[PDB]
Design an enzyme around this catalytic site. Sequence first.
Site, PDB file in Angstrom:
ATOM      1  N   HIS A 122      56.587  79.599  34.905  1.00 33.24           N
ATOM      2  CA  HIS A 122      57.726  79.711  34.022  1.00 33.24           C
ATOM      3  C   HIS A 122      57.341  80.480  32.740  1.00 33.24           C
ATOM      4  O   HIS A 122      56.272  80.260  32.175  1.00 33.24           O
ATOM      5  CB  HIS A 122      58.184  78.269  33.767  1.00 33.24           C
ATOM      6  CG  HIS A 122      59.482  78.079  33.085  1.00 33.24           C
ATOM      7  ND1 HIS A 122      59.738  78.476  31.785  1.00 33.24           N
ATOM      8  CD2 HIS A 122      60.612  77.500  33.516  1.00 33.24           C
ATOM      9  CE1 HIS A 122      60.996  78.175  31.474  1.00 33.24           C
ATOM     10  NE2 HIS A 122      61.546  77.569  32.495  1.00 33.24           N
ATOM     11  N   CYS A 127      67.396  74.950  33.725  1.00 32.22           N
ATOM     12  CA  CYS A 127      67.193  76.224  34.398  1.00 32.22           C
ATOM     13  C   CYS A 127      66.518  76.004  35.744  1.00 32.22           C
ATOM     14  O   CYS A 127      66.982  76.502  36.769  1.00 32.22           O
ATOM     15  CB  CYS A 127      66.432  77.195  33.487  1.00 32.22           C
ATOM     16  SG  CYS A 127      64.951  76.497  32.713  1.00 32.22           S
TER      17      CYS A 127
HETATM   18  N1  LIG Z   1      64.675  78.995  29.041  1.00 30.51           N
HETATM   19  C1  LIG Z   1      65.491  78.436  28.155  1.00 30.51           C
HETATM   20  O1  LIG Z   1      65.506  78.836  26.975  1.00 30.51           O
HETATM   21  C2  LIG Z   1      66.348  77.270  28.595  1.00 30.51           C
HETATM   22  C3  LIG Z   1      66.759  77.195  29.921  1.00 30.51           C
HETATM   23  C4  LIG Z   1      67.572  76.166  30.345  1.00 30.51           C
HETATM   24  C5  LIG Z   1      68.016  75.221  29.446  1.00 30.51           C
HETATM   25  N2  LIG Z   1      67.656  75.294  28.123  1.00 30.51           N
HETATM   26  C6  LIG Z   1      68.110  74.223  27.190  1.00 30.51           C
HETATM   27  O2  LIG Z   1      69.038  74.739  26.231  1.00 30.51           O
HETATM   28  C7  LIG Z   1      68.902  74.024  24.978  1.00 30.51           C
HETATM   29  C8  LIG Z   1      68.714  75.030  23.868  1.00 30.51           C
HETATM   30  O3  LIG Z   1      67.441  75.689  24.112  1.00 30.51           O
HETATM   31  P1  LIG Z   1      67.029  77.103  23.475  1.00 30.51           P
HETATM   32  O4  LIG Z   1      65.934  77.713  24.312  1.00 30.51           O
HETATM   33  O5  LIG Z   1      68.263  77.900  23.174  1.00 30.51           O
HETATM   34  O6  LIG Z   1      66.408  76.592  22.074  1.00 30.51           O
HETATM   35  P2  LIG Z   1      66.593  77.183  20.591  1.00 30.51           P
HETATM   36  O7  LIG Z   1      66.397  78.663  20.659  1.00 30.51           O
HETATM   37  O8  LIG Z   1      65.759  76.434  19.598  1.00 30.51           O
HETATM   38  O9  LIG Z   1      68.158  76.824  20.376  1.00 30.51           O
HETATM   39  C9  LIG Z   1      68.526  75.663  19.577  1.00 30.51           C
HETATM   40  C10 LIG Z   1      69.491  76.100  18.502  1.00 30.51           C
HETATM   41  O10 LIG Z   1      70.160  74.930  17.962  1.00 30.51           O
HETATM   42  C11 LIG Z   1      70.179  74.991  16.555  1.00 30.51           C
HETATM   43  N3  LIG Z   1      70.233  73.617  16.057  1.00 30.51           N
HETATM   44  C12 LIG Z   1      69.307  72.618  16.242  1.00 30.51           C
HETATM   45  N4  LIG Z   1      69.670  71.471  15.719  1.00 30.51           N
HETATM   46  C13 LIG Z   1      70.928  71.719  15.183  1.00 30.51           C
HETATM   47  C14 LIG Z   1      71.854  70.901  14.500  1.00 30.51           C
HETATM   48  N5  LIG Z   1      71.644  69.612  14.236  1.00 30.51           N
HETATM   49  N6  LIG Z   1      73.021  71.468  14.099  1.00 30.51           N
HETATM   50  C15 LIG Z   1      73.235  72.763  14.374  1.00 30.51           C
HETATM   51  N7  LIG Z   1      72.440  73.624  15.004  1.00 30.51           N
HETATM   52  C16 LIG Z   1      71.290  73.038  15.392  1.00 30.51           C
HETATM   53  C17 LIG Z   1      68.949  75.797  16.169  1.00 30.51           C
HETATM   54  O11 LIG Z   1      69.166  76.401  14.895  1.00 30.51           O
HETATM   55  P3  LIG Z   1      67.744  76.767  14.232  1.00 30.51           P
HETATM   56  O12 LIG Z   1      67.265  77.996  15.000  1.00 30.51           O
HETATM   57  O13 LIG Z   1      68.071  77.082  12.784  1.00 30.51           O
HETATM   58  O14 LIG Z   1      66.810  75.568  14.381  1.00 30.51           O
HETATM   59  C18 LIG Z   1      68.879  76.833  17.293  1.00 30.51           C
HETATM   60  O15 LIG Z   1      69.596  78.032  17.006  1.00 30.51           O
HETATM   61  C19 LIG Z   1      67.725  73.043  25.164  1.00 30.51           C
HETATM   62  O16 LIG Z   1      68.173  71.716  25.381  1.00 30.51           O
HETATM   63  C20 LIG Z   1      66.972  73.595  26.381  1.00 30.51           C
HETATM   64  O17 LIG Z   1      66.393  72.637  27.255  1.00 30.51           O
HETATM   65  C21 LIG Z   1      66.829  76.316  27.693  1.00 30.51           C
END
Ligand SMILES: NC(=O)c1ccc[n+]([C@@H]2O[C@H](COP(=O)([O-])OP(=O)(O)OC[C@H]3O[C@@H](n4cnc5c(N)ncnc54)[C@H](OP(=O)(O)O)[C@@H]3O)[C@@H](O)[C@H]2O)c1
Lengths: 335, 335, 336, 336
Positions: D179, D152
């Site tokens: 942030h 992001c």
């Molecule tokens: N501000 C932001 O949120 C932001 C901005 C830019 C980039 N990102 C990036 O986007 C990615 C996701 O972040 P997020 O904020 O969306 O985190 P999050 O809410 O924890 O999303 C991760 C998801 O992946 C699932 N998961 C994890 N391990 C898995 C596996 N082995 N098989 C299947 N599903 C699995 C989790 O299910 P469970 O919920 O059941 O664990 C959860 O729904 C990260 O790498 C982060 O750096 C985030």
Amino acid sequence: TIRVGINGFGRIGRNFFRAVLERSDDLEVVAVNDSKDNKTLSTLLKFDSIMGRLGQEVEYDDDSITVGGKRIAVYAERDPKNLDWAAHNVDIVIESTGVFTDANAAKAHIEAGAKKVIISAPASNEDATFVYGVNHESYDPENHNVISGASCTTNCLAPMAKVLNDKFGIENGLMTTVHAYTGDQRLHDAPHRDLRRARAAAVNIVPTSTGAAKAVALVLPELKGKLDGYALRVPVITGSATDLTFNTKSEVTVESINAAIKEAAVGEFGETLAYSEEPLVSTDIVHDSHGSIFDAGLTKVSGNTVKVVSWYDNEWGYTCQLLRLTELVASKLLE
Amino acid sequence: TIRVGINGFGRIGRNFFRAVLERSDDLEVVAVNDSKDNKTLSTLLKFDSIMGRLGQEVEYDDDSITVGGKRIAVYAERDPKNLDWAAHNVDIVIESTGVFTDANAAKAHIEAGAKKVIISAPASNEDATFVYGVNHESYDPENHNVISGASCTTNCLAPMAKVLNDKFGIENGLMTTVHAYTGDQRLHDAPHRDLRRARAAAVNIVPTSTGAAKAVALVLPELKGKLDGYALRVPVITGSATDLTFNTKSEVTVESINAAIKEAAVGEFGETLAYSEEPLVSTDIVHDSHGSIFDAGLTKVSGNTVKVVSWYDNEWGYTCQLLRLTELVASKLLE
Amino acid sequence: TIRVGINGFGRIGRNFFRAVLERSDDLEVVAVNDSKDNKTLSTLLKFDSIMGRLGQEVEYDDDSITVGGKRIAVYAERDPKNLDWAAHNVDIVIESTGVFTDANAAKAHIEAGAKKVIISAPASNEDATFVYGVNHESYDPENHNVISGASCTTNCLAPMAKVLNDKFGIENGLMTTVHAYTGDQRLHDAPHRDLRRARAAAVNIVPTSTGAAKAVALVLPELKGKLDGYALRVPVITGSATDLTFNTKSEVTVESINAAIKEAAVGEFGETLAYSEEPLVSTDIVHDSHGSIFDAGLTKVSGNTVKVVSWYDNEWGYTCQLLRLTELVASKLLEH
Amino acid sequence: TIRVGINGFGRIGRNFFRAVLERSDDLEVVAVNDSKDNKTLSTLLKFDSIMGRLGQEVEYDDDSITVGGKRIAVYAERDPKNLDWAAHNVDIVIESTGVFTDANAAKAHIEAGAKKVIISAPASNEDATFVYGVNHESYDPENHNVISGASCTTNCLAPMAKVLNDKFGIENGLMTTVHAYTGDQRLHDAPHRDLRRARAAAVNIVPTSTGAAKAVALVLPELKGKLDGYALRVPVITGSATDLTFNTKSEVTVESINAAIKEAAVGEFGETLAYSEEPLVSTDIVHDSHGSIFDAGLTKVSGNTVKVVSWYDNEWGYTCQLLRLTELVASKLLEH
Ligand SMILES: NC(=O)c1ccc[n+]([C@@H]2O[C@H](COP(=O)([O-])OP(=O)(O)OC[C@H]3O[C@@H](n4cnc5c(N)ncnc54)[C@H](OP(=O)(O)O)[C@@H]3O)[C@@H](O)[C@H]2O)c1
Ligand SMILES: NC(=O)c1ccc[n+]([C@@H]2O[C@H](COP(=O)([O-])OP(=O)(O)OC[C@H]3O[C@@H](n4cnc5c(N)ncnc54)[C@H](OP(=O)(O)O)[C@@H]3O)[C@@H](O)[C@H]2O)c1
Ligand SMILES: NC(=O)c1ccc[n+]([C@@H]2O[C@H](COP(=O)([O-])OP(=O)(O)OC[C@H]3O[C@@H](n4cnc5c(N)ncnc54)[C@H](OP(=O)(O)O)[C@@H]3O)[C@@H](O)[C@H]2O)c1
Ligand SMILES: NC(=O)c1ccc[n+]([C@@H]2O[C@H](COP(=O)([O-])OP(=O)(O)OC[C@H]3O[C@@H](n4cnc5c(N)ncnc54)[C@H](OP(=O)(O)O)[C@@H]3O)[C@@H](O)[C@H]2O)c1
């Protein structure tokens, strides 16, 4: 014991009262002037959303608030001409209302019988401005009668800037203070002269201007014209960080920047400026008595560009700086 | 299209404007009266900490704010005698300032050329008070000229109370509304006539009084003297829940309490009162247009004691109720 | 010095440790079992977002943390069977993990050397449940070896429910507790067995269940079947209020309800239950050592329907109640 | 209709799904893999504490969720090797779990039938990294099969860094991003590998690292070694600003810095980078579809030291950038 009066019993005024109670052996607050009834004032003193309950008993009548058995005279003159400080043998008045930052107006307290006035804010027409630890040695007990303790942010930035400029030299720097929301801001979106401070404070990052970086020049003349910055107001109730990014002609690393702070942050100066390698977050510096808590873990260097970060409790840390200044004034000639 | 004026362009006034734009086919806002410059007013309309950006273009000059090409006349008369509503063919004025809840004073708008005034608050000396869905059938187009849409909380409680009293009878009930903080509260601890509302709103649970439960009696006379309650203000910016605990002579279960709501929450009434079995939290009812969202999952019963809980967006839900009332008035004789 | 061990060094465990340092002359914590590494444990002890900094130096190693010069043995055994509490002569273990509230499992600490286990939570199969100030006198030092200190909400509710029932008789009552978010709630919308506690805690009013009003029957059997309720979790980090609405057969006024609490709220019971006429908001009861702070200003009466409201610091107030129970235990026989 | 699958249905996955519904005519999500049960998945999709309610009916079963009448196949395989993306003819998989940012592991989706993988995060060993609007033109549909949409913060920083470097030359720059808290931070003081992110997120300013200023070199090689920085996580649920301070050799004023952004912020690039003179606060950029909203009012110049500030919705803005990258990919050859 030198006897002290507070004009303005707001956040800063009440902080100062508590700081005297907690931290001072040589000052006593014996009168207060404020525009509110003593039930209201005594309740706000007793209970605080930030500091918790005052440990002492508080009572009041129509003339006074009594705190742990000590009677504090209370007045409500909106013009400091109507006050009589000499009647309670107050030598120093802390001017904390926000509406007498003009020394030509704060002078009224001296006409009303005080000998010294300390403005708890950037001031105009003042005899002098101090950041304790930085330029307090220049206090002149005969000629510095209405003075300023500068701002919270300046009290955070100047100690750090003194050390780094002394050791490496600062050509130019720009500051972002990431700052707790303050009482000038709105709870809900509503008119304000600053259309960003108009916006609901506890759910927004709110950018706003501050003179605090230019004001460093008042206490460190060698940095005049070399510092500016602004503030991002964020949703915590107190606790702030000063992030300064500067250019130096010196060749510098993260480790040498940090070593300079560590070496300076000692003795009496170290009550103003601390050096930390701890995993700090804002709640860790709430009620910290230093003006500046340098966070060595955040120091960055790219080429000749340096980023340093110092924490401060914009309420309590500032107030302890002001208390240090008040103890200095009280320790020298009062006429 | 009946032409509408708003007096007071605060949270409620701006909500109402947006609600007309989003939801109404038969009303148009053509003038506004408020004490601020059009740059400030137009900025607060355009950007909102709760509702997001207005989707339409906003411009302004010294006389007006233009919204999606439609010119809104703006005035700043602090006394509604100086206004001229007839000059813009405004038939209905929404009285949202907070300082003309006295119908004897709100009447000024009619002298200034309007035909109807709707006070967006508990009122005094009004021709009548309505909670849309509950008693709006009693609106008398010839004799109800200055009226009240009651309070947010009353608009939440009365629909639910009507259904339960109708079906089981309510002997006595006591309400706790767990309510978003509002603009009457302080950001930082500071003087207030209510020494609890004095306390920093976004870090406290703040108990405060409300007439909203007694005010049910205005729209449901059968409950006069049988309801009271209070509010706990909590740190969310909007979104509230009304928790009513009551005694009934009926023999009742959780399932029969819920079935009564479900059976009533239908047709037009179901735009006022909804029935939900969803896993709701406050953010789920933000910008919900119902006055009352009954949460069947929270219903409790012990003996003859019943606890029911209904949600409301104290801003938007209330405003949609007021808009429903405004459409009713606009749909009948205007003189 | 009665020696205490803590299993589960989370919010309640760290509160207990601090409360021992702050308020006890008789107890000393000598050992802790927890799943984390000692660098993390020692950091979270030193620095607290709610309680501020510990006023004592903290050091650590592979085997221990040292607090103000006193060595605390640290273990990280998932299974209490693999602990040896005897090894440091601990007599009472505070069971504060959350996952051994079944007395049938928490018993394992006795097998591993403890004489007593105090579960910092509603329990199943326990010898006894106590709200200090309400029924602690029934504590039996022979037969009550694995016990519950009940929940925060129960420790707020039971003391005023006792007073008012005794004075006026409660027919039925329903409670809402407006409660600070807890560590099990999610920061961002994310999976949880409770689909409401799944929801971003610091921006939501979150309704959830509590056993608290039914668990009051364990400690006041006279109220069995007469109380129920639920919680609204709201965005403050600690501090809570319990709002109880009940119907009674007596003739009661605001003045009479309030006078009943004031009379009772004195002496040692008055360290459990306070009576306040102050203009309280939740920050005012943060770090208050009472289990229940009755707010006289919130009392309402409508016919035979009564509403009363009491505050509690669901962390510190609860912890102080639990310390009161632990001191009681530790003042009697610790055999076996 | 190019068919898309999502691995990891968390904040970013659910944002992506919504953004597809809201802003794409060419893409359709037909399958999702995630660790949770479908009752939970479907509830968290229907209701969002930030985005509000989905404006479509949602149903679920053991095998799927149905959104506005369209059946999405749902799997819960921990190991991507056990997926069959071919089974529903998905061409692009969005990899948004957080745990397969190594391209060497994310490649497994291609073995399981995908033609392309887009990692919603900084990646290791990837074919390529893109900030849409900055270097997407270098996308190679033969050789770029597992790619990163970067972070992001990088999607906010890179677009204005490109404009200003190109116009004035950046010597070095240091960044602070202020942030919104994220889901990995703890609600209450609790264990975390980052001992600051351990700390109660909604009541703290929490300093933490970010690769973002160094990851800008991946997309603007001209800036390698010239940028660094860190994050301050603060208590808002979404919305962030990147504060960049750099020194340049050119002679620059506030007016000249700002004019450089305004000139560039038009056309398709202007959907990545906006130029604003509005009185913005963080709530004003929530659900803004730009990667970077330059705030002209925050520009400062002191000698040769320059400060500039750009906003971003770290959820929605990032997601929109990622959708822009996915559309690009999906507009070219999807072989194999
Ligand atoms: N501000 C932001 O949120 C932001 C901005 C830019 C980039 N990102 C990036 O986007 C990615 C996701 O972040 P997020 O904020 O969306 O985190 P999050 O809410 O924890 O999303 C991760 C998801 O992946 C699932 N998961 C994890 N391990 C898995 C596996 N082995 N098989 C299947 N599903 C699995 C989790 O299910 P469970 O919920 O059941 O664990 C959860 O729904 C990260 O790498 C982060 O750096 C985030
Ligand atoms: N973070 C900080 O809070 C911070 C940091 C650094 C410096 N400062 C400076 O400290 C000063 C005080 O700020 P604050 O935060 O304490 O604001 P505050 O809470 O509003 O305190 C100001 C008080 O002055 C009183 N007052 C106003 N006019 C008066 C008059 N004519 N006579 C007597 N009392 C009068 C007000 O009483 P009523 O409320 O009854 O009107 C109010 O309580 C300001 O100049 C500010 O810039 C503050
Ligand atoms: N949750 C809710 O917000 C809620 C729910 C139910 C009912 N209500 C009721 O709705 C009403 C409006 O409340 P609110 O929340 O909108 O408060 P608000 O944000 O303060 O709105 C009131 C507005 O009235 C304006 N005003 C005051 N005196 C005026 C005058 N003489 N002439 C013209 N404009 C004047 C003010 O303009 P300036 O700011 O420029 O002075 C202010 O913007 C109240 O009566 C309230 O009880 C509110
Ligand atoms: N408001 C309150 O917080 C409150 C009030 C009244 C009662 N209680 C009760 O007190 C208990 C503890 O709650 P809390 O708020 O303190 O939760 P918490 O912060 O999660 O405390 C639980 C602690 O136990 C540790 N742990 C878990 N399983 C373990 C195991 N098998 N072996 C060793 N250590 C283990 C955890 O270590 P990790 O951190 O590494 O997982 C954590 O430090 C709960 O039963 C709760 O109902 C809480």
